[PDB]
Structure formats: structure tokens, C-alpha cells
């Protein structure tokens, strides 16, 4: 019976498809590790896929995955138990050390480029033709932290040029230096920008960027991780 053959054949196909999909999804993060970073005995029932190579644009080289995985940074955490499966405590200030929800990845220390090889994200003042087209313009608004104190003032939008979107607010602090805050972590109001994730005293610790007119993928990850981290680690300073 043709329908019987069809359904039988389909289930065989589906099993192979799932096997394929799972192995494709092991191209990052595997082989699995013990807590001490050595290879785990149990790697699961799926073998690693054969490597593929992505050719990156603008002379950025290639990425071959799977390949040798390394964190490429120190991780300031220590065991809290004598057996596997428990949390690892920050050995210093987790916001400063970039662990837990304050974590960052050692991404490339160059900016993301657009299709024409220009920096994807620029301050709006250096972005020709770009302006606020709708909504409250945050530039000039005071910035308030979760302690309900003013941490600084908005002095520009960082904009994604190809995707024409606001990505960061640039905030000037009391000392005249500036930091980037992710646009997804601020609330633009009529009279202020409010940031729940950080108290005013934590704004100075936001990682700085090397150049005034560009931000690298490494810098973005440090900024974004730090700000997200404040939701856990600034909680005693967050007025409710």
C-alpha cells in the first residue's frame, strides 16, 4: 500500500532530519566540558559535525566551526561545593569582572561593518542625513538611575546606519566623559531617560570605548553585559 510506504518512509526521513539538525546545532560550544574546563566523559549520543568554513567579508578572514573553543579571557569565579552542579561564586566584583549576568564574550575588537564596508554603528552627529524622525528625542534629557538620582545627560544617539535604528544613547557623566547605554535598556520619558538596570554610582563603571566615533564588537559586548548585570547586582541600590 502506497500510503503505508509513504508514512513509513517519512518517519525514517524525519529521524535523519532531526539527527542532522541536532549535529548542525553542535557547531558552537562542543565538546562539552567539566567545570574545570577539561573534556567531559559524556558528550551525548550525537557526534560533532564535519567542519564548515564561513568566508567573512571585507578581508575579515574566515570562521571554521566546530573548532578549538577557548574563552580567551580570565573567569573570576570559584566553586561553592565539593561536587558538580552547583553555582560558582564571583571571586571579586562580578560587574567589574564580567561574570554572571554581567558576562561578555571576547568578540573581535573591530566594529561590525555594513555591506559597503563602512562602520555599521555611528554617532548620529557623524551620520550624514540622519535625524530623529518620530517619538521623543532623548538628546538633552537627564538620565536617572534606579536609585532615582541623576547619573548624567544624553548627548547623542548611536544609530545603525543600514537598519536606520537607534542602538545606544551616549550619556555624559559629571566628569565630562561619556558612556554608551543600550537603547533596549532605557526608558525614554517626557522629562528624563530612566535606567532601571543601574544605580547612578554604577554609570562610571560602564566600560569605555577607545574611539569617539566607533564601537567595536568587543566593546559592545562589555557595555551590554555590564548594564544587563546591574539588574542582578545593583538590586540593593534599586529603590522600589
Amino acid at each position: 500500500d502506497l500510503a503505508s510506504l509513504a508514512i513509513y518512509s517519512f518517519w525514517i526521513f524525519l529521524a535523519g532530519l532531526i539527527y542532522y539538525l541536532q549535529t548542525e546545532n553542535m557547531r558552537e560550544g562542543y565538546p562539552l566540558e567539566n567545570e574545570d574546563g577539561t573534556p567531559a566523559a559524556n558528550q551525548g549520543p550525537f557526534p560533532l559535525p564535519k567542519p564548515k568554513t564561513f568566508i567573512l567579508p571585507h578581508g575579515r578572514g574566515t570562521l571554521t566551526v566546530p573548532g578549538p573553543e577557548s574563552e580567551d579571557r580570565p573567569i573570576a569565579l570559584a566553586r561553592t561545593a565539593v561536587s558538580e552542579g552547583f553555582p560558582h561564586a564571583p571571586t571579586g566584583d562580578p560587574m567589574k569582572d564580567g561574570v554572571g549576568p554581567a558576562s561578555w564574550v571576547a568578540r573581535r575588537d573591530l566594529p561590525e561593518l555594513d555591506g559597503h564596508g563602512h562602520n555599521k554603528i555611528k554617532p548620529m552627529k557623524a551620520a550624514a542625513g540622519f535625524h530623529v524622525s518620530a517619538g521623543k528625542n532623548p538628546i538633552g534629557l537627564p538620565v536617572r538611575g534606579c536609585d532615582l538620582e541623576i547619573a548624567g545627560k544624553v548627548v547623542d544617539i548611536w544609530v545603525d546606519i543600514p537598519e536606520q535604528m537607534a542602538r545606544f544613547l551616549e550619556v555624559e557623566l559629571k566628569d565630562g566623559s561619556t558612556r554608551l547605554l543600550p537603547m533596549q535598556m532605557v526608558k525614554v520619558q517626557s522629562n528624563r531617560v530612566h535606567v532601571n538596570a543601574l544605580s547612578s554610582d554604577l554609570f562610571a563603571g560602564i566600560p569605555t570605548i577607545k574611539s569617539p566615533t566607533e564601537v567595536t564588537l568587543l566593546e559592545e559586548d562589555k557595555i551590554c553585559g555590564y548594564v544587563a548585570g546591574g539588574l542582578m547586582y545593583a538590586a540593593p541600590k534599586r529603590k522600589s
Partner: protein, 301 residues
């Protein structure tokens, strides 16, 4: 409390006229207008659009399909616009009766117009498919969109072309009408012994439900990690970031396994492809090989 569902502040710069690669620029329109409305949720920019010969063919046929059905509707309304609006969902352009088999000998008012409408649809859809292939090729991209589109075209072809041919008449095809095609769908199941006993119908539902499950999961996940640039998925594939790691670990910790920024899109395309792939198979087998799924299920064969 900001959730990134709607943008708080829109920015606009010069119109993005796009990447060139091997695209024939003479066939691109100018940019359209900018919609502030759209811009709250997605991109504000409309256009440009590429319109070569194959696209003009596709659009023309599509409109001719639409207008052919419309003219029949107006006729059924007695050319009265009040009756046209009143009975809009009730009008139907119906295929030829079984007597005419697979021939084109049926009169205009008794199947002929349905064949004309269907011809225009056939050309519209297939030319749109070539265009999906060709726009990818001009940009040097993979053909995934065209391969997926083929799985959807499969179900459509089975319903209106392949199954009717195998069943020996155009009368087996779907009519063009809002209520009538729902009536046809209900009837199709009744006549074939209840489609809930068709295992490919069951699978098709699994994947349809599964597509909503998966896009809810993925959409939510990416919005949840958008505070780390998560939606920039191509660069996250090329150079994994904390967005990609937190996304994976959410799912690893929740359900004990996870995806990658690239691999989740393979889950995505296949979940959705399999809806229409299994679906077309289920419909094609109905009446050609299996007259009654309940009966088949009792055997099974």
C-alpha cells in the same frame, strides 16, 4: 520595564538603495515613501522594488487572475454594487462539472472562466518562483527561499492541478470564493472519511502548531537578548557574542538542549517546510490511493 516590541525613537537617514552585486540596476524602481506608522515596529522605508520582465509577467497574471474572479462576481451580483458588497463572501467561480473531465471544452459560464483564472494563477505563481530564485542569484545568495517556496507550491499544485489530473477531472479542484472554498475543504474531509485519520494531516498540524511554538520561542528569545545586539544574527554566527550564549543557555537550562544562532534557522525553515510538504502528500493520496482514511487506519492499507 522596556520590552522592545515597539521602538521608542525612530531615526531616518538617506534612502537605502541597497546592495548592487550582479543586479541589473535599470530594473529597480526609485525608493517609495517612508511610513512612520511601519517604523514603530519595523523599517519605515518602502521600496525600491525590482521589476524585470518576469516580475511584470507575474504581477500582470496575478491581477488578471484576481480580475477574472472579480468579473464573475460582478456578473453574479447582476452588476449591482450593493448586491456585490452584500453577497461578496458568497460568490464563487466554480470549476467545470465532472462531465467535462480534463478537457477545456466547458462553456465560459460553466467552468471555462475557472480555467482561464487558474491559468493566470499558474503563470503568476511559477513566474514568482523563478523571480525568487533569480533575485537571490543576482545577490550571490543561497537559494533557500526558492527551495522553501517549492514546498508551498507543492500543496497548491496538488490541490488545483496534480490531484485533479490524477482523479480525471477539473471538478475535483478548489473553487475561487471565500465561503465556497471553506465548504470545499469541509466536504473534502467528509468524502474521504475524516482527515483526522490521515497521518499526513496529523503531521501537517504538528508542524503548523510547531511553527507557532518555534517562532514564539525564537522571536521571544531574540527580543530577550536584543539588549546584547541579539537580532544581528549574521554577525553572531560569524563571531558568537553573549547574546548568542545567553540564548543557548536559556534553553539548555530549561529543556536540556539548545541551538546555535545559525542552526535555529535550520530548525525554522524545516518546521515550516514540513507543513506543506506532508500536507501535499496527504492530499495527493486522498482519493487516488485512499478513498477513506478511517477505513485505511483500521488496516492500515
Amino acid at each position: 520595564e522596556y520590552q522592545n516590541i515597539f521602538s521608542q525613537v525612530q531615526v531616518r537617514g538617506p534612502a537605502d538603495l541597497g546592495m548592487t552585486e550582479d543586479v541589473n540596476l535599470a530594473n529597480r524602481s526609485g525608493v517609495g515613501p517612508f511610513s512612520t506608522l511601519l517604523g514603530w515596529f519595523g523599517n519605515a522605508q518602502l521600496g525600491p522594488i525590482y521589476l524585470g520582465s518576469l516580475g511584470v509577467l507575474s504581477l500582470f497574471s496575478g491581477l488578471m487572475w484576481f480580475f477574472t474572479i472579480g468579473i464573475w462576481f460582478w456578473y453574479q451580483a447582476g452588476w449591482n454594487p450593493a448586491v456585490f458588497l452584500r453577497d461578496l463572501f458568497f460568490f464563487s467561480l466554480e470549476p467545470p462539472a465532472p462531465e467535462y473531465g480534463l478537457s477545456f471544452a466547458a462553456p465560459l459560464k460553466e467552468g471555462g472562466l475557472w480555467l482561464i483564472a487558474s491559468f493566470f494563477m499558474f503563470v503568476a505563481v511559477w513566474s514568482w518562483w523563478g523571480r525568487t530564485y533569480l533575485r537571490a542569484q543576482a545577490l550571490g545568495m543561497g537559494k533557500h527561499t526558492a527551495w522553501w517556496f517549492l514546498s508551498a507550491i507543492w500543496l497548491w499544485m496538488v490541490l488545483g492541478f496534480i490531484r485533479p489530473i490524477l482523479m480525471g477531472s477539473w471538478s475535483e479542484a478548489v473553487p475561487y470564493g471565500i465561503f465556497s472554498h471553506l465548504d470545499w475543504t469541509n466536504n473534502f474531509s467528509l468524502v474521504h472519511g475524516n482527515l483526522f485519520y490521515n497521518p499526513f494531516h496529523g503531521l501537517s498540524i504538528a508542524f503548523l502548531y510547531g511553527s507557532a511554538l518555534l517562532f514564539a520561542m525564537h522571536g521571544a528569545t531574540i527580543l530577550a537578548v536584543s539588549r546584547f545586539g541579539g537580532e544581528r544574527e549574521l554577525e553572531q554566527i560569524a563571531d558568537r557574542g553573549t547574546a548568542a550564549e545567553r540564548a543557548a543557555l536559556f534553553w539548555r537550562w530549561t529543556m536540556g538542549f539548545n541551538a546555535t544562532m545559525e542552526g535555529i534557522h535550520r530548525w525554522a525553515i524545516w518546521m515550516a517546510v514540513l507543513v506543506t510538504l506532508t500536507g501535499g502528500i496527504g492530499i495527493l493520496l486522498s482519493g487516488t490511493v485512499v478513498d477513506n482514511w478511517y477505513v485505511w487506519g483500521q488496516n492500515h492499507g
